[PDB]
Each structure stands twice: as C-alpha cells, then as structure tokens.
Amino acid sequence: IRRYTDQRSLDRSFGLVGQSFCAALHQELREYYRLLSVLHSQLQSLT
Amino acid sequence: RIHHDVNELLSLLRVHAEVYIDLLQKNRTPYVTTTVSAHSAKVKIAEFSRTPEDFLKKYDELKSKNTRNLDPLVYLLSKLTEDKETLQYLQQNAK
C-alpha cells in the first residue's frame, strides 16, 4: 500500500482525484501506525 | 397463462368427459411454492432395493445440485401403485 501510494502520489499527471486519494491512504497509514507500539507495550487474553 | 405447452399438450400427450377438464383439475397457480412433501417421504426408495446404495445415494447429490425442483417429487417417488401402468408403455413405444 505504501509503494503504490507514494508511486501514484508522486505522479503530477495523476491529478487531484488520485493525489487526495493517496493522501487519504497516507493518513490511514498514519492511523495504522498506532497499534504497532501497543503490540510492543503489552509485552513490555492476548495469546 | 402458458397452459399450451405444459397443460394442453401434456393433456393431449396421454395415451388414454375430462378431456378439457383435466387441465382445470391440474390448474396450477404460478405464484405458489407450496410443496406437500416431508422428511417421511424419503423412505419411498427403500421398496426398490434392486441396488439400494445406488438408490439412496442419489438424493443427497440431487439436493446438492442447485435446483429447487427436487421438493415436489414425494408423490412422484411412490408413483403409480398399479403394475407398470406408466413404465411398461416405453417398451411398446420403442417398437
């Protein structure tokens, strides 16, 4: 999703419909980054 | 509506007044689905035990087929109680 997202958002011919779309993909990736430190800190029922 | 092919022709196709009244007796309603079958009618194939494994195995495969027409065959599994009153005409017809 990251590789598709930056490789489509870098394309200036891809337009606003596509740039805002991949910006939404970026923000959903930023929201996705939350739980990866939780999975850390619960080791610092799960099983 | 379309009683020409499956009621008039089916009434005319019999080898034997109720010539036109048989379609009114078998006047089907196309808006229904009311089968009179039950799970007790599954033992109708047990009387024909010529090869009962390949007489009992067919019903699960016919149910596993994606057609919903296997339900009204409860009376048709028993069929006619007269001795070969439908089955024996094919041997005369093949000649």
């Binding site: 029922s45 799960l46 099983t47 | -």
Partner: protein, 129 residues
C-alpha cells in the same frame, strides 16, 4: 483422546477459510455480510483458545478433562461447518440464499445451540438486502 479434540480444531480451519473466500468480493451482497460476522467468529474461537493456551507452563490442562472443557465450547465454533455447505450448494446469493438461512434460523431445536449462530448471521447478512 487426542481425536476427541481433533474435530473442533479441524472445524476452525474450515471457518477461517470461510473468511478468506466468502470475503473476497465476487460472491454477492448477502455472502460478504456473512463473512463479516465470521470474521468475529474466528477471533471469538481464538479468544476462547487464548483462555487455555497459556496453561502448559503451570499444568492445569489434562487430556481426559480437555474434553470436559471443550464440550460446552464447541458451540461457538462447530455450528459453522454446516453454514459453509449452506452457501456452497451452488454458490448461492441474494434472497435465494436468505431463504435457506431463514429456514436455518429455526433449524436445530432439541439441543438449540445451532439456532442462534444462524439467526445472528441472518441479522448481519440480510440487513443490506
């Protein structure tokens, strides 16, 4: 006594497959909504197993009485192996599978634990239809 526990564990692999086929989007509106709750059923069964899978480091488990632990616990899992057949009859969809799920929502009445899963799946599955 291992083979007493084998079929529930076997049943789980049919139901996580019912996720990863019936939640690919080609099957139909009613069908994806069933797998949307079968998502919940696999984590429910694995959360159940997470109440036991810790225990080997302290020895509470035993081979005879794991049957006693699993006998009320299959009802979260071992209903759904049949719900697979209920969609896999002809790749059924739409109202023509909701009729079968409708009559399956009243199906088992003597034990009466297989009714609720079909009922609760019909609630999720019929809503978008």
């Amino acid at each position: 006594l291992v083979h007493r526990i084998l079929p529930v564990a076997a049943s789980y692999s049919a139901v996580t497959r019912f996720i990863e086929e019936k939640s690919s989007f080609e099957y139909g509106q009613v069908n994806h909504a069933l797998a949307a709750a079968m998502r919940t059923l696999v984590k429910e069964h694995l959360i159940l197993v997470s109440q036991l899978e810790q225990l080997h480091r302290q020895g509470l488990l035993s081979l005879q009485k794991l049957w006693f632990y699993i006998q009320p616990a299959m009802r979260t899992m071992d209903i759904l192996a049949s719900l697979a057949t209920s969609v896999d009859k002809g790749e059924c969809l739409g109202g023509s599978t909701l009729s079968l799920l409708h009559d399956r929502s009243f199906s088992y009445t003597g034990d009466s634990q297989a009714q609720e899963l079909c009922l609760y799946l019909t609630k999720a599955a019929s809503a978008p239809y």
